[PDB]
Amino acid sequence: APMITCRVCQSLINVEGKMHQHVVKCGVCNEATPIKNAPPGKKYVRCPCNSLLIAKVTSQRIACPRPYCKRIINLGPVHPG
Ligand SMILES: [Zn+2]
Ligand SMILES: [Zn+2]
C-alpha cells in the first residue's frame, strides 16, 4: 500500500485509491493531512488544536472554528503601532 504519515499523530495512512484527494483522514487521530497543495491563492494552516484550516495567502490572522478551540492564529509577524 502507498502510505503517507499523518502530520498530527504520525500513524500511517493507507492512501490506496485516495491519491486524487486534496487531504486524507487519519483513522487514529481523526485529523486531516494534506496530500496536495492548497488550491491557488490558499494555504493550509495547522491549528494547535490539530485542525487543518484553509487561509488565504493574504490573510494575516485566521480563527479556528472548532467550538472547543476558537483560537486565533497569527500567520505572520506585525509591526508596532
Ligand atoms: Zn493521525
Ligand atoms: Zn483549533
mmCIF file of N, CA and C and ligand atoms in Angstrom:
data_model
loop_
_atom_site.group_PDB
_atom_site.id
_atom_site.type_symbol
_atom_site.label_atom_id
_atom_site.label_comp_id
_atom_site.label_asym_id
_atom_site.label_seq_id
_atom_site.Cartn_x
_atom_site.Cartn_y
_atom_site.Cartn_z
ATOM 1 N N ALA A 1 0.804 -1.217 0.000
ATOM 2 C CA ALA A 1 0.000 0.000 0.000
ATOM 3 C C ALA A 1 0.839 1.268 0.000
ATOM 4 N N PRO A 2 0.538 2.223 -0.890
ATOM 5 C CA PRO A 2 1.073 3.577 -0.697
ATOM 6 C C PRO A 2 0.593 4.085 0.656
ATOM 7 N N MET A 3 1.474 4.774 1.358
ATOM 8 C CA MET A 3 1.171 5.182 2.719
ATOM 9 C C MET A 3 1.719 6.574 2.919
ATOM 10 N N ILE A 4 0.948 7.417 3.575
ATOM 11 C CA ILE A 4 1.520 8.671 3.998
ATOM 12 C C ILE A 4 1.441 8.742 5.518
ATOM 13 N N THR A 5 2.324 9.553 6.079
ATOM 14 C CA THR A 5 2.392 9.736 7.521
ATOM 15 C C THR A 5 1.455 10.855 7.958
ATOM 16 N N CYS A 6 0.569 10.543 8.902
ATOM 17 C CA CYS A 6 -0.322 11.548 9.463
ATOM 18 C C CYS A 6 0.504 12.664 10.078
ATOM 19 N N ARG A 7 0.226 13.921 9.691
ATOM 20 C CA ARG A 7 1.014 15.026 10.251
ATOM 21 C C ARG A 7 0.649 15.364 11.687
ATOM 22 N N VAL A 8 -0.376 14.749 12.246
ATOM 23 C CA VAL A 8 -0.784 15.055 13.615
ATOM 24 C C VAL A 8 -0.270 14.026 14.610
ATOM 25 N N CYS A 9 -0.512 12.747 14.361
ATOM 26 C CA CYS A 9 -0.152 11.684 15.288
ATOM 27 C C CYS A 9 0.920 10.745 14.769
ATOM 28 N N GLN A 10 1.306 10.865 13.509
ATOM 29 C CA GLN A 10 2.338 10.090 12.836
ATOM 30 C C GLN A 10 1.961 8.643 12.540
ATOM 31 N N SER A 11 0.708 8.252 12.713
ATOM 32 C CA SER A 11 0.218 6.982 12.210
ATOM 33 C C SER A 11 0.310 6.926 10.692
ATOM 34 N N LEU A 12 0.413 5.730 10.162
ATOM 35 C CA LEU A 12 0.466 5.586 8.729
ATOM 36 C C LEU A 12 -0.940 5.571 8.176
ATOM 37 N N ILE A 13 -1.160 6.323 7.103
ATOM 38 C CA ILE A 13 -2.467 6.405 6.482
ATOM 39 C C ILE A 13 -2.361 5.663 5.154
ATOM 40 N N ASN A 14 -3.203 4.683 4.950
ATOM 41 C CA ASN A 14 -3.252 3.984 3.672
ATOM 42 C C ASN A 14 -3.950 4.850 2.637
ATOM 43 N N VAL A 15 -3.243 5.210 1.578
ATOM 44 C CA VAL A 15 -3.824 6.092 0.584
ATOM 45 C C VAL A 15 -4.126 5.376 -0.732
ATOM 46 N N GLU A 16 -4.276 4.050 -0.711
ATOM 47 C CA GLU A 16 -4.733 3.339 -1.905
ATOM 48 C C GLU A 16 -6.097 3.837 -2.388
ATOM 49 N N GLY A 17 -6.136 4.302 -3.625
ATOM 50 C CA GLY A 17 -7.344 4.827 -4.183
ATOM 51 C C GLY A 17 -7.692 6.218 -3.731
ATOM 52 N N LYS A 18 -6.843 6.862 -2.942
ATOM 53 C CA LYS A 18 -7.154 8.176 -2.416
ATOM 54 C C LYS A 18 -6.208 9.247 -2.898
ATOM 55 N N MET A 19 -5.241 8.913 -3.754
ATOM 56 C CA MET A 19 -4.259 9.913 -4.171
ATOM 57 C C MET A 19 -4.859 11.049 -4.997
ATOM 58 N N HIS A 20 -6.115 10.935 -5.443
ATOM 59 C CA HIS A 20 -6.789 12.049 -6.095
ATOM 60 C C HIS A 20 -7.316 13.093 -5.112
ATOM 61 N N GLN A 21 -7.306 12.821 -3.805
ATOM 62 C CA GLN A 21 -7.901 13.738 -2.838
ATOM 63 C C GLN A 21 -6.949 14.872 -2.534
ATOM 64 N N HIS A 22 -7.499 15.969 -2.003
ATOM 65 C CA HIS A 22 -6.639 17.045 -1.535
ATOM 66 C C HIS A 22 -6.074 16.689 -0.147
ATOM 67 N N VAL A 23 -6.877 16.025 0.684
ATOM 68 C CA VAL A 23 -6.490 15.657 2.034
ATOM 69 C C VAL A 23 -6.938 14.232 2.307
ATOM 70 N N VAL A 24 -6.270 13.584 3.237
ATOM 71 C CA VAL A 24 -6.712 12.276 3.688
ATOM 72 C C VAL A 24 -6.931 12.321 5.197
ATOM 73 N N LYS A 25 -7.954 11.616 5.669
ATOM 74 C CA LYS A 25 -8.232 11.450 7.097
ATOM 75 C C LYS A 25 -7.439 10.302 7.712
ATOM 76 N N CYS A 26 -6.869 10.588 8.852
ATOM 77 C CA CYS A 26 -6.261 9.604 9.710
ATOM 78 C C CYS A 26 -7.341 8.968 10.574
ATOM 79 N N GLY A 27 -7.427 7.641 10.523
ATOM 80 C CA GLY A 27 -8.403 6.933 11.325
ATOM 81 C C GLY A 27 -8.047 6.888 12.779
ATOM 82 N N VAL A 28 -6.783 7.100 13.111
ATOM 83 C CA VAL A 28 -6.359 7.057 14.506
ATOM 84 C C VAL A 28 -6.703 8.351 15.239
ATOM 85 N N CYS A 29 -6.281 9.524 14.734
ATOM 86 C CA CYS A 29 -6.479 10.758 15.485
ATOM 87 C C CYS A 29 -7.676 11.548 14.977
ATOM 88 N N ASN A 30 -8.281 11.103 13.899
ATOM 89 C CA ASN A 30 -9.381 11.736 13.179
ATOM 90 C C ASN A 30 -9.081 13.131 12.652
ATOM 91 N N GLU A 31 -7.847 13.372 12.280
ATOM 92 C CA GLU A 31 -7.499 14.636 11.685
ATOM 93 C C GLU A 31 -7.112 14.458 10.222
ATOM 94 N N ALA A 32 -7.061 15.573 9.506
ATOM 95 C CA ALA A 32 -6.762 15.543 8.089
ATOM 96 C C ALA A 32 -5.301 15.930 7.856
ATOM 97 N N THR A 33 -4.672 15.244 6.935
ATOM 98 C CA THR A 33 -3.367 15.603 6.383
ATOM 99 C C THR A 33 -3.463 15.960 4.917
ATOM 100 N N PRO A 34 -2.844 17.056 4.486
ATOM 101 C CA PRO A 34 -2.871 17.439 3.069
ATOM 102 C C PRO A 34 -1.983 16.546 2.232
ATOM 103 N N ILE A 35 -2.508 16.162 1.079
ATOM 104 C CA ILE A 35 -1.850 15.365 0.053
ATOM 105 C C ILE A 35 -1.477 16.225 -1.147
ATOM 106 N N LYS A 36 -2.139 17.344 -1.355
ATOM 107 C CA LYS A 36 -1.816 18.234 -2.447
ATOM 108 C C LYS A 36 -1.598 19.619 -1.892
ATOM 109 N N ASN A 37 -1.043 20.501 -2.725
ATOM 110 C CA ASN A 37 -1.004 21.901 -2.358
ATOM 111 C C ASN A 37 -2.425 22.387 -2.187
ATOM 112 N N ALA A 38 -2.606 23.329 -1.282
ATOM 113 C CA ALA A 38 -3.858 24.065 -1.206
ATOM 114 C C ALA A 38 -4.119 24.620 -2.604
ATOM 115 N N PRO A 39 -5.378 24.801 -2.974
ATOM 116 C CA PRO A 39 -5.677 25.435 -4.271
ATOM 117 C C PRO A 39 -5.049 26.805 -4.341
ATOM 118 N N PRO A 40 -4.847 27.314 -5.560
ATOM 119 C CA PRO A 40 -4.166 28.597 -5.734
ATOM 120 C C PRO A 40 -4.802 29.718 -4.936
ATOM 121 N N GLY A 41 -3.949 30.494 -4.294
ATOM 122 C CA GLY A 41 -4.342 31.623 -3.509
ATOM 123 C C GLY A 41 -4.736 31.280 -2.105
ATOM 124 N N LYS A 42 -4.561 30.030 -1.722
ATOM 125 C CA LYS A 42 -4.891 29.472 -0.430
ATOM 126 C C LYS A 42 -3.644 28.786 0.086
ATOM 127 N N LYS A 43 -3.627 28.545 1.395
ATOM 128 C CA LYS A 43 -2.581 27.803 2.051
ATOM 129 C C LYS A 43 -3.193 27.003 3.199
ATOM 130 N N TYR A 44 -2.627 25.857 3.472
ATOM 131 C CA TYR A 44 -3.104 25.044 4.585
ATOM 132 C C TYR A 44 -2.426 25.541 5.851
ATOM 133 N N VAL A 45 -3.189 25.624 6.931
ATOM 134 C CA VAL A 45 -2.715 26.083 8.244
ATOM 135 C C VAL A 45 -3.102 25.000 9.255
ATOM 136 N N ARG A 46 -2.152 24.526 10.089
ATOM 137 C CA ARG A 46 -2.463 23.573 11.178
ATOM 138 C C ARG A 46 -2.699 24.334 12.487
ATOM 139 N N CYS A 47 -3.922 24.335 12.991
ATOM 140 C CA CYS A 47 -4.184 24.868 14.302
ATOM 141 C C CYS A 47 -3.462 24.054 15.367
ATOM 142 N N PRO A 48 -3.043 24.721 16.443
ATOM 143 C CA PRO A 48 -2.618 23.994 17.629
ATOM 144 C C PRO A 48 -3.624 22.983 18.134
ATOM 145 N N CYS A 49 -4.922 23.150 17.901
ATOM 146 C CA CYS A 49 -5.854 22.094 18.318
ATOM 147 C C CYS A 49 -5.777 20.816 17.446
ATOM 148 N N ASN A 50 -5.021 20.839 16.350
ATOM 149 C CA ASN A 50 -4.734 19.837 15.351
ATOM 150 C C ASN A 50 -5.639 19.970 14.134
ATOM 151 N N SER A 51 -6.598 20.883 14.111
ATOM 152 C CA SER A 51 -7.493 21.026 12.966
ATOM 153 C C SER A 51 -6.739 21.608 11.778
ATOM 154 N N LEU A 52 -6.948 21.035 10.619
ATOM 155 C CA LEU A 52 -6.416 21.568 9.383
ATOM 156 C C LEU A 52 -7.364 22.650 8.894
ATOM 157 N N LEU A 53 -6.828 23.837 8.657
ATOM 158 C CA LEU A 53 -7.565 25.007 8.223
ATOM 159 C C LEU A 53 -7.024 25.439 6.859
ATOM 160 N N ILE A 54 -7.871 26.169 6.132
ATOM 161 C CA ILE A 54 -7.547 26.878 4.890
ATOM 162 C C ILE A 54 -7.548 28.367 5.186
ATOM 163 N N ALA A 55 -6.532 29.081 4.691
ATOM 164 C CA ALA A 55 -6.437 30.524 4.813
ATOM 165 C C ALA A 55 -6.128 31.075 3.434
ATOM 166 N N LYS A 56 -6.489 32.330 3.213
ATOM 167 C CA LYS A 56 -5.951 32.995 2.042
ATOM 168 C C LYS A 56 -4.467 33.257 2.259
ATOM 169 N N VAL A 57 -3.703 33.320 1.162
ATOM 170 C CA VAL A 57 -2.288 33.694 1.290
ATOM 171 C C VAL A 57 -2.107 35.158 1.677
ATOM 172 N N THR A 58 -3.127 35.975 1.542
ATOM 173 C CA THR A 58 -3.047 37.335 2.046
ATOM 174 C C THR A 58 -3.496 37.459 3.500
ATOM 175 N N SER A 59 -4.003 36.384 4.112
ATOM 176 C CA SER A 59 -4.540 36.510 5.458
ATOM 177 C C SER A 59 -3.408 36.647 6.459
ATOM 178 N N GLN A 60 -3.564 37.607 7.386
ATOM 179 C CA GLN A 60 -2.607 37.775 8.476
ATOM 180 C C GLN A 60 -3.008 36.959 9.703
ATOM 181 N N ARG A 61 -4.289 36.753 9.891
ATOM 182 C CA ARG A 61 -4.780 36.039 11.039
ATOM 183 C C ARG A 61 -5.968 35.246 10.545
ATOM 184 N N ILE A 62 -6.116 34.068 11.101
ATOM 185 C CA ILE A 62 -7.263 33.215 10.885
ATOM 186 C C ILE A 62 -7.676 32.731 12.255
ATOM 187 N N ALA A 63 -8.973 32.582 12.459
ATOM 188 C CA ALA A 63 -9.520 31.980 13.663
ATOM 189 C C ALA A 63 -9.860 30.529 13.388
ATOM 190 N N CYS A 64 -9.591 29.683 14.314
ATOM 191 C CA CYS A 64 -10.053 28.312 14.200
ATOM 192 C C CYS A 64 -11.539 28.237 14.491
ATOM 193 N N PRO A 65 -12.255 27.420 13.785
ATOM 194 C CA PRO A 65 -13.695 27.323 14.036
ATOM 195 C C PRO A 65 -14.140 26.297 15.067
ATOM 196 N N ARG A 66 -13.287 25.327 15.381
ATOM 197 C CA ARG A 66 -13.713 24.255 16.253
ATOM 198 C C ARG A 66 -14.322 24.844 17.529
ATOM 199 N N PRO A 67 -15.500 24.401 17.952
ATOM 200 C CA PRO A 67 -16.124 25.063 19.111
ATOM 201 C C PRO A 67 -15.265 25.010 20.354
ATOM 202 N N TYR A 68 -14.550 23.902 20.552
ATOM 203 C CA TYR A 68 -13.696 23.734 21.720
ATOM 204 C C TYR A 68 -12.413 24.537 21.624
ATOM 205 N N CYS A 69 -12.169 25.218 20.504
ATOM 206 C CA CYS A 69 -10.886 25.862 20.262
ATOM 207 C C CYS A 69 -11.052 27.369 20.119
ATOM 208 N N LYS A 70 -11.563 27.844 18.988
ATOM 209 C CA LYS A 70 -11.788 29.242 18.697
ATOM 210 C C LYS A 70 -10.512 30.033 18.841
ATOM 211 N N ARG A 71 -9.383 29.369 18.650
ATOM 212 C CA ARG A 71 -8.078 30.005 18.750
ATOM 213 C C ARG A 71 -7.809 30.969 17.605
ATOM 214 N N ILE A 72 -7.066 32.021 17.904
ATOM 215 C CA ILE A 72 -6.532 32.947 16.921
ATOM 216 C C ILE A 72 -5.156 32.468 16.517
ATOM 217 N N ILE A 73 -4.880 32.471 15.217
ATOM 218 C CA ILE A 73 -3.607 32.009 14.690
ATOM 219 C C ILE A 73 -2.979 33.164 13.949
ATOM 220 N N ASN A 74 -1.796 33.564 14.378
ATOM 221 C CA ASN A 74 -1.061 34.645 13.741
ATOM 222 C C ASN A 74 -0.225 34.049 12.628
ATOM 223 N N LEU A 75 -0.615 34.333 11.394
ATOM 224 C CA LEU A 75 0.065 33.779 10.238
ATOM 225 C C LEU A 75 1.244 34.652 9.811
ATOM 226 N N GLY A 76 1.614 35.641 10.624
ATOM 227 C CA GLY A 76 2.808 36.413 10.382
ATOM 228 C C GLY A 76 3.077 37.414 11.480
ATOM 229 N N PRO A 77 4.337 37.851 11.583
ATOM 230 C CA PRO A 77 4.663 38.983 12.457
ATOM 231 C C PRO A 77 4.056 40.275 11.931
ATOM 232 N N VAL A 78 3.894 41.219 12.858
ATOM 233 C CA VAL A 78 3.266 42.505 12.619
ATOM 234 C C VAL A 78 4.302 43.574 12.966
ATOM 235 N N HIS A 79 3.969 44.828 12.665
ATOM 236 C CA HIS A 79 4.791 45.947 13.084
ATOM 237 C C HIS A 79 4.102 46.699 14.209
ATOM 238 N N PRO A 80 4.836 47.539 14.928
ATOM 239 C CA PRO A 80 4.255 48.194 16.103
ATOM 240 C C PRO A 80 3.218 49.217 15.681
ATOM 241 N N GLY A 81 2.469 49.682 16.675
ATOM 242 C CA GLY A 81 1.567 50.805 16.496
ATOM 243 C C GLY A 81 0.122 50.378 16.558
HETATM 244 ZN ZN ZN B 1 -3.309 10.782 12.905
HETATM 245 ZN ZN ZN B 2 -8.199 24.944 16.561
#
